[PDB]
Short mmCIF file of C-alpha atoms and ligand atoms in Angstrom, two decimals:
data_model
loop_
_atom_site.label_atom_id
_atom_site.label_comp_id
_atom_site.label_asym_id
_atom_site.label_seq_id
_atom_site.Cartn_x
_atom_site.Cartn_y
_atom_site.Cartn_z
CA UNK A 1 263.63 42.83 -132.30
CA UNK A 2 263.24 45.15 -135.23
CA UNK A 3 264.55 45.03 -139.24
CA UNK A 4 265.13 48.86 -140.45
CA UNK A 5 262.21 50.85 -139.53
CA UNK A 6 259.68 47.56 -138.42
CA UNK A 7 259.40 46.28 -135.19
CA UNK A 8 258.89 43.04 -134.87
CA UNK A 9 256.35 42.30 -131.94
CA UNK A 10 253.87 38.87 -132.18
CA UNK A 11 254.34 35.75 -133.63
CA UNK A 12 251.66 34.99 -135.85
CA UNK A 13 253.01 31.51 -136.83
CA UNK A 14 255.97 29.49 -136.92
CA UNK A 15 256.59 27.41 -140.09
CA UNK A 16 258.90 24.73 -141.65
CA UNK A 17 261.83 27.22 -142.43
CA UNK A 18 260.70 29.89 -140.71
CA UNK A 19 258.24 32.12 -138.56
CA UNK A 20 255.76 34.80 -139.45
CA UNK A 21 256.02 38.13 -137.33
CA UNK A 22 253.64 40.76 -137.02
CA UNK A 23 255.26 43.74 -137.94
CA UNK A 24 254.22 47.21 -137.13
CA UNK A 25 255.93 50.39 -138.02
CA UNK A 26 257.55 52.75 -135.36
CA UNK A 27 256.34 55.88 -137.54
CA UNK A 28 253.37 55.15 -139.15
CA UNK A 29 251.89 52.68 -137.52
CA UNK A 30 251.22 49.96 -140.18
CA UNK A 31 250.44 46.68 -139.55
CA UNK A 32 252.09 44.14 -142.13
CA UNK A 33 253.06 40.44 -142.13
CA UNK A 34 256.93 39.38 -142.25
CA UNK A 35 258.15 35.95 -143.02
CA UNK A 36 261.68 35.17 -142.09
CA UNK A 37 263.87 32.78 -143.53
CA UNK A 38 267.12 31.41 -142.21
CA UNK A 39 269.39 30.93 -144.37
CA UNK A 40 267.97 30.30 -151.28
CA UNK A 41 267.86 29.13 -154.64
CA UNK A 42 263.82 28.46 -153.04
CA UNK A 43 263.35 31.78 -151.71
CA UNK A 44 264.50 33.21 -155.42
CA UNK A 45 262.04 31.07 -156.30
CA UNK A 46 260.02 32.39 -154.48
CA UNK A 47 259.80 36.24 -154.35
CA UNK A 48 260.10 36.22 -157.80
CA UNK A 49 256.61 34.30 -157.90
CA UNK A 50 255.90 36.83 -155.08
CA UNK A 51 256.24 39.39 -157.24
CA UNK A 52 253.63 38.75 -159.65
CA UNK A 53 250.98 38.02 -157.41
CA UNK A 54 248.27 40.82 -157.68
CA UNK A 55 244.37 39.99 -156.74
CA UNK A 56 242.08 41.06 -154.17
CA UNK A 57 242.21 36.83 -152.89
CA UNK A 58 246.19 36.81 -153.01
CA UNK A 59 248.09 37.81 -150.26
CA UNK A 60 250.43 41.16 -151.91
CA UNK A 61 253.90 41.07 -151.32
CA UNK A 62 255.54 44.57 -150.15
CA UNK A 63 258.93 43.71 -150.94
CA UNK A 64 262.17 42.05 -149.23
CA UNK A 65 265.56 42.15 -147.37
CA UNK A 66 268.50 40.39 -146.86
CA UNK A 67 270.14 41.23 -143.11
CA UNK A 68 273.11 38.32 -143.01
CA UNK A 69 271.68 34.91 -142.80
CA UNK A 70 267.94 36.12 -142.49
CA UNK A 71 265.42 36.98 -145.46
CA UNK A 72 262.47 39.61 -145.05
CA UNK A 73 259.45 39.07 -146.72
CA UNK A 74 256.87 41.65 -146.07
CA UNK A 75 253.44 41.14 -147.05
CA UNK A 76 249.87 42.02 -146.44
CA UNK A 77 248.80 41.37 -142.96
CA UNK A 78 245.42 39.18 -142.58
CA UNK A 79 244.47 39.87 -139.24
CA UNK A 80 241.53 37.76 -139.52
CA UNK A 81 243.88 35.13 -138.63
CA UNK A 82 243.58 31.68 -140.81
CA UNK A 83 240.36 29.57 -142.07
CA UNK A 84 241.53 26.57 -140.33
CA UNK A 85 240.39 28.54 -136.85
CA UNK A 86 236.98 29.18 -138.23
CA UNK A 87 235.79 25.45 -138.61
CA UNK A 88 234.13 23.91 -135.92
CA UNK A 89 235.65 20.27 -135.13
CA UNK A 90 233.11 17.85 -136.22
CA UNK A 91 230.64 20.47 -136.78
CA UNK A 92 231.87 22.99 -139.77
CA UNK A 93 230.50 25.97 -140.30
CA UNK A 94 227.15 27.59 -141.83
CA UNK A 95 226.52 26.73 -144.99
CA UNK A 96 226.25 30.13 -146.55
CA UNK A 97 229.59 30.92 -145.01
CA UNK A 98 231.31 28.18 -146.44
CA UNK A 99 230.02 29.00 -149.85
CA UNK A 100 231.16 32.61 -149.59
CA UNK A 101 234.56 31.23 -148.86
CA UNK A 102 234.40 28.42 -151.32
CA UNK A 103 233.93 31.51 -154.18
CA UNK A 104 236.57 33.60 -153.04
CA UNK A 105 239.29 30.00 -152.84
CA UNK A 106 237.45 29.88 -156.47
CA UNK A 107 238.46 33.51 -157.51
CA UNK A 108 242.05 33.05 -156.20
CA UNK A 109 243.17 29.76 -157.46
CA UNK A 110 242.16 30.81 -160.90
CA UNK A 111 244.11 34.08 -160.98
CA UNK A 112 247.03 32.32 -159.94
CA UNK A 113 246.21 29.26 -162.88
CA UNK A 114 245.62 32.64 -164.91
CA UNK A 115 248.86 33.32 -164.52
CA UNK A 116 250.46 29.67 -165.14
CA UNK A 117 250.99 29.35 -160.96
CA UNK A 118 250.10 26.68 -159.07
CA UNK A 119 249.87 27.01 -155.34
CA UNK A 120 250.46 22.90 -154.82
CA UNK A 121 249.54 23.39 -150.76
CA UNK A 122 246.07 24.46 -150.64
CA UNK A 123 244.48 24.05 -146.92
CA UNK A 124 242.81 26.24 -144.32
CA UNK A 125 246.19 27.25 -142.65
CA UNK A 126 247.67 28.49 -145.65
CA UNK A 127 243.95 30.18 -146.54
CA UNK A 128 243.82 33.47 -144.53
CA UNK A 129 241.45 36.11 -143.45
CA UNK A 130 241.48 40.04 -143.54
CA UNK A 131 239.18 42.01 -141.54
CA UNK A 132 236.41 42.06 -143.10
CA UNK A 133 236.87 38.22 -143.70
CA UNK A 134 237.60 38.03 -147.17
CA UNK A 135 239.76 35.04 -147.60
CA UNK A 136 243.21 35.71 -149.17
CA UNK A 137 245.62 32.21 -150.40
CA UNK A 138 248.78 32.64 -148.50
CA UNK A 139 252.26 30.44 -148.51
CA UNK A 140 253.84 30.69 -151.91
CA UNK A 141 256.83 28.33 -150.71
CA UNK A 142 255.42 25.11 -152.83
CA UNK A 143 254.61 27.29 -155.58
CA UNK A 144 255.20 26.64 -158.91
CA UNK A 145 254.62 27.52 -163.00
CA UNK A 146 253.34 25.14 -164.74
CA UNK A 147 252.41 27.35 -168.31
CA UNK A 148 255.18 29.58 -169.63
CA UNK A 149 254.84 31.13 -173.09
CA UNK A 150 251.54 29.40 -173.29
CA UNK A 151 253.01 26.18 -172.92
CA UNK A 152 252.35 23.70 -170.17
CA UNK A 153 254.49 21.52 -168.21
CA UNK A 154 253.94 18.75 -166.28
CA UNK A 155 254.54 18.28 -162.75
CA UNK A 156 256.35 15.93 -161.04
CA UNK A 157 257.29 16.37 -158.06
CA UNK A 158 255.63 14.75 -154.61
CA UNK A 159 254.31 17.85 -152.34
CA UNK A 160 252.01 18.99 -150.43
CA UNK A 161 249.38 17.96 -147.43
CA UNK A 162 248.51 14.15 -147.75
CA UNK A 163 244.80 14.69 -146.65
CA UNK A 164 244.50 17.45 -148.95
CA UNK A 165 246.95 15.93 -152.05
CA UNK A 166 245.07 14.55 -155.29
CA UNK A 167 245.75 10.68 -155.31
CA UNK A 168 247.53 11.18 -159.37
CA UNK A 169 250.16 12.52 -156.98
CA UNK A 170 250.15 9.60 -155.54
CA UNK A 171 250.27 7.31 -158.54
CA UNK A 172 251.43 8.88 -161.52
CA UNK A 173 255.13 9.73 -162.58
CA UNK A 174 253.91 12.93 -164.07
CA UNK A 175 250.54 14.89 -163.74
CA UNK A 176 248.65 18.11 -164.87
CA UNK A 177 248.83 21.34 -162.03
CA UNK A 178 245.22 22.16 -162.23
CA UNK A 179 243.23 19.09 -161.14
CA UNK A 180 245.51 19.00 -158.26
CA UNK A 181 244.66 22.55 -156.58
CA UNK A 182 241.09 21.63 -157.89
CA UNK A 183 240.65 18.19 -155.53
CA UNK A 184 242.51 20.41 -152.37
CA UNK A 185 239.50 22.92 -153.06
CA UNK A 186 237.02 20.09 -152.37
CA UNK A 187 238.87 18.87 -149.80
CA UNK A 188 238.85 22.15 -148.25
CA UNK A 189 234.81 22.43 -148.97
CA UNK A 190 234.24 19.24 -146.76
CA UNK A 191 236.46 20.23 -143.98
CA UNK A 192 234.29 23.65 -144.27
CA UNK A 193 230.74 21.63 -144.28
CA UNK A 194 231.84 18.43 -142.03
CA UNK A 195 234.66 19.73 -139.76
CA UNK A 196 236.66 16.87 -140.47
CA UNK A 197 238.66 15.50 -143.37
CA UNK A 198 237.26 12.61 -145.43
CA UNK A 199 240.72 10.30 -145.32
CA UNK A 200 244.39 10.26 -144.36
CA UNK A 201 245.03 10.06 -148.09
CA UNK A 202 243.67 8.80 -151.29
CA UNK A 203 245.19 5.74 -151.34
CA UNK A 204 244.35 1.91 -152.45
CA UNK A 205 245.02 0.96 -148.85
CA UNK A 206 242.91 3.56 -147.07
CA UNK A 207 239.81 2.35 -146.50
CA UNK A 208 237.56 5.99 -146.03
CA UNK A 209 239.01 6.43 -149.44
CA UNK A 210 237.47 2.99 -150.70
CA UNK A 211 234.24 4.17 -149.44
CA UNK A 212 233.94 6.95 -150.87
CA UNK A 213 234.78 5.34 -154.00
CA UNK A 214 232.09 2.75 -153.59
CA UNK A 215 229.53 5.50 -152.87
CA UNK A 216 228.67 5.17 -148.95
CA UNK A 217 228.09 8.45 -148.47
CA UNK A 218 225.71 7.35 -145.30
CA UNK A 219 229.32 7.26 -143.80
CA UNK A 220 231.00 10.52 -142.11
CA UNK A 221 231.35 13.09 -143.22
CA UNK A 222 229.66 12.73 -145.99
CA UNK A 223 226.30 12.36 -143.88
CA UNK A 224 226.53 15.92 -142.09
CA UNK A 225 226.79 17.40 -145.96
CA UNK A 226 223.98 18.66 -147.71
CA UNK A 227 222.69 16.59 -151.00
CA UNK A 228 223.03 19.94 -153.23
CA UNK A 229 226.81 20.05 -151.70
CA UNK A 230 227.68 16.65 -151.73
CA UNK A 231 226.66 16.71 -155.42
CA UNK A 232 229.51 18.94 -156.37
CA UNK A 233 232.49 16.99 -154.32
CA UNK A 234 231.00 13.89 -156.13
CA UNK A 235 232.65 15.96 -159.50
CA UNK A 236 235.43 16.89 -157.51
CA UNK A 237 236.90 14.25 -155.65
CA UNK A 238 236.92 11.73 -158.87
CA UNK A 239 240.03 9.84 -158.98
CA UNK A 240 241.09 10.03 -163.02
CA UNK A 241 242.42 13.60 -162.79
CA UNK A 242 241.31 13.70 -166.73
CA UNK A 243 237.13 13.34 -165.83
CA UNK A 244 237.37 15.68 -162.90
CA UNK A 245 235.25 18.59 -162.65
CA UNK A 246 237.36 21.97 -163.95
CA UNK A 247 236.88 25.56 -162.81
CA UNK A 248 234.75 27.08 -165.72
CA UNK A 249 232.54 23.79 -164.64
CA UNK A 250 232.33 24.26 -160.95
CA UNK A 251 230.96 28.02 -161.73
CA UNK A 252 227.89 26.15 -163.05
CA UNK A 253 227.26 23.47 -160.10
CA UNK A 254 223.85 24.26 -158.81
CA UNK A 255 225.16 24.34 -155.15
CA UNK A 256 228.06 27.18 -156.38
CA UNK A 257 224.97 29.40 -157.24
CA UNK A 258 222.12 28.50 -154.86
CA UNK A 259 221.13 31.86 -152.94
CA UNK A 260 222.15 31.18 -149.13
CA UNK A 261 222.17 33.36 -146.06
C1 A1K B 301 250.62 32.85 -140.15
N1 A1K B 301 250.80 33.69 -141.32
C2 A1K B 301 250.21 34.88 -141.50
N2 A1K B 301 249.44 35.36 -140.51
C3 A1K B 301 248.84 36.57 -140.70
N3 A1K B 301 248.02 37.08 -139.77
C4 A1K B 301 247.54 36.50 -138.62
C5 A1K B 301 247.53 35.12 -138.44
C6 A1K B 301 247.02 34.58 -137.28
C7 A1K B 301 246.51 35.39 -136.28
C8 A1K B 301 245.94 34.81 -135.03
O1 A1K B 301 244.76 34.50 -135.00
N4 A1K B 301 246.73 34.76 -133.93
C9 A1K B 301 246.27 34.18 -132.67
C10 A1K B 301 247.27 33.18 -132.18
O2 A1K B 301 248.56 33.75 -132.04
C11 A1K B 301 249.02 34.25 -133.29
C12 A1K B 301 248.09 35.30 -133.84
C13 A1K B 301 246.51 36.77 -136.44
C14 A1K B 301 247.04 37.33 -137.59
O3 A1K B 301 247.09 38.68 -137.85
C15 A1K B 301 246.87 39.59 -136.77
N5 A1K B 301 248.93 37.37 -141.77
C16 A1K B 301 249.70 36.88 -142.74
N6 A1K B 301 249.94 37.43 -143.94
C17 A1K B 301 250.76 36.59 -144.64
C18 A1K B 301 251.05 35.52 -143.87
CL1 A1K B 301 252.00 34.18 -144.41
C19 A1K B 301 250.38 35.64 -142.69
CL1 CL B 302 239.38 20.16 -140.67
NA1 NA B 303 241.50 18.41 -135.01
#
């Protein structure tokens, strides 16, 4: 299987709508990345948010094509494989790893808020690693803008990854973009420093989310995290979307800038 001069020759992932090849070019040699679609009002959607994406923690797109019923995307390859492999069930990973990660997640998400994007699925799967393990936010299928001509609108739509979704989204007819991606970033952190998630969702009727609420942080996983750590998902996982901790404010948690190794 092939699409003009690619060959198409490892499945890196299979998706929703869809499967990810790895792609290497009969020529050149190239490795890339090529999503395809069967079957598009979304995928206009899509590439055209595709399009604009350009930062080092981004995953570029190369461009597209249309072959009868199937779409092309072509992207940068991360051959690291995905973040989700890297964390140790019920352990994590070290520390100092985590936070290196943790900055670069940082660096991405607010490019893309930079440029009135919201990503609305943010979870180790869709957060992906190139070879020298720099962490790149793939999966712009849930994507979104919520700024246009300086201008924001609110979101309401249900999506997402219920562990990882922001409980507004839960409760609220309409709701802001940012603290969304902001509470899948903590989220994310724990799963990085606990190897497991916290809840099923963040709910009234789940009752790891009551406890958390009511402090008991002598519970898993809150009891494998470190007290400099666990300080900054006590600003981040805070239910009124409005008090949450914001972006410019995580870059001056003590944990975000502690020296590690
Ligand atoms: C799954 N999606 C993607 N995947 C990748 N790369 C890779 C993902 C996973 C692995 C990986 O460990 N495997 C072991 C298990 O059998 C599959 C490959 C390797 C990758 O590369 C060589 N690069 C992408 N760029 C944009 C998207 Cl979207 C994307
Ligand atoms: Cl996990
Ligand atoms: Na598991």
């Amino acid at each position: 299987p092939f699409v003009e001069d690619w060959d198409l020759v490892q499945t890196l992932g299979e998706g929703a709508y869809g499967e990810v090849q790895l792609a290497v070019n009969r020529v050149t040699e190239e490795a890339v990345a090529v999503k395809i679609v069967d079957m598009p009002e979304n995928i206009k959607k899509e590439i055209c948010i595709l399009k604009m994406l350009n930062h080092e923690n981004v995953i570029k797109f190369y461009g597209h094509r249309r072959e009868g019923n199937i779409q092309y995307l072509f992207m940068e390859l991360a051959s690291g494989g995905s973040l989700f492999d890297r964390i140790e069930p019920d352990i994590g990973m070290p520390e100092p790893d985590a936070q290196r990660f943790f900055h670069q997640l940082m660096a991405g998400v607010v490019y893309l808020h930079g440029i009135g994007i919201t990503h609305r699925d943010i979870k180790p799967h869709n957060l992906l690693l190139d070879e020298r393990d720099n962490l790149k936010i793939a999966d712009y299928s849930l994507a979104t803008v919520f700024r246009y001509n300086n201008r924001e609108r609110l979101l309401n739509k249900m999506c997402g990854t219920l562990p990882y979704v922001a409980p507004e989204l839960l409760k609220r007819r309409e709701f802001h973009a940012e603290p969304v991606d902001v509470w899948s970033c903590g989220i994310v952190l724990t799963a990085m420093l606990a190897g497991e998630l916290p809840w099923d969702q963040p709910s009234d009727s789940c009752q790891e989310y009551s406890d958390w609420k009511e402090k008991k942080t002598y519970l898993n996983p809150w009891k494998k995290i470190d007290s400099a750590p666990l300080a900054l998902l006590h600003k981040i996982l805070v239910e009124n979307p409005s008090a949450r901790i914001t972006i410019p404010d995580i870059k001056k948690d003590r944990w975000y800038n502690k020296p590690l190794k």
